[PDB]
C-alpha cells in the first residue's frame, strides 16, 4: 500500500552494499547476508 518513491529503488540500493561486501576479500569471512536476503524478500511483496 505504502509504495512511496523512496521505496521504489530500495530493491537496487541493498544490492549495491552486498557487492561491496563481496568485493572486499578479507570481509567475506564475516559474510552472513543470507539472513538479510530472507528478510528483504518478506519486506517486498508481503506475505502474511
Amino acid at each position: 500500500s505504502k509504495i512511496a518513491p523512496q521505496c521504489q529503488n530500495l530493491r537496487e540500493q541493498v544490492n549495491q552494499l552486498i557487492e561491496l561486501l563481496r568485493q572486499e576479500p578479507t570481509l567475506r569471512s564475516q559474510q552472513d547476508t543470507s539472513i538479510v536476503e530472507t528478510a528483504l524478500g518478506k519486506a517486498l511483496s508481503p506475505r502474511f
Binding site: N9, Q13, Q16, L17
Partner: protein
C-alpha cells in the same frame, strides 16, 4: 667498524635512485588512498537513501559516515 665508517659513500652511491623510489612509492599510496575515497562515497549515497525511505514510517536509523578527517 670500518664498514660503518663509509656510510656517506653509500648515501652518495644510491642518491641517484632514491628519488625515483620515493616518487613511485608516494604515488602508490595516493592511488590506493583515493580508491577507497571513491568507494565510501558510493556507500554514503546508498545508506542515505535507505534512511530516507524508512524515515517516512519507522525511526530506526542507520550509521552514516562523515568528517573522517
Amino acid at each position: 667498524q670500518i664498514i660503518l665508517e663509509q656510510y656517506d659513500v653509500a648515501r652518495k652511491y644510491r642518491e641517484q635512485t632514491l628519488e625515483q623510489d620515493a616518487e613511485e612509492k608516494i604515488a602508490r599510496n595516493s592511488r590506493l588512498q583515493s580508491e577507497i575515497k571513491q568507494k565510501i562515497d558510493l556507500y554514503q549515497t546508498s545508506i542515505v537513501s535507505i534512511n530516507e525511505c524508512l524515515k517516512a514510517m519507522q525511526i530506526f536509523e542507520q550509521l552514516p559516515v562523515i568528517t573522517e578527517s
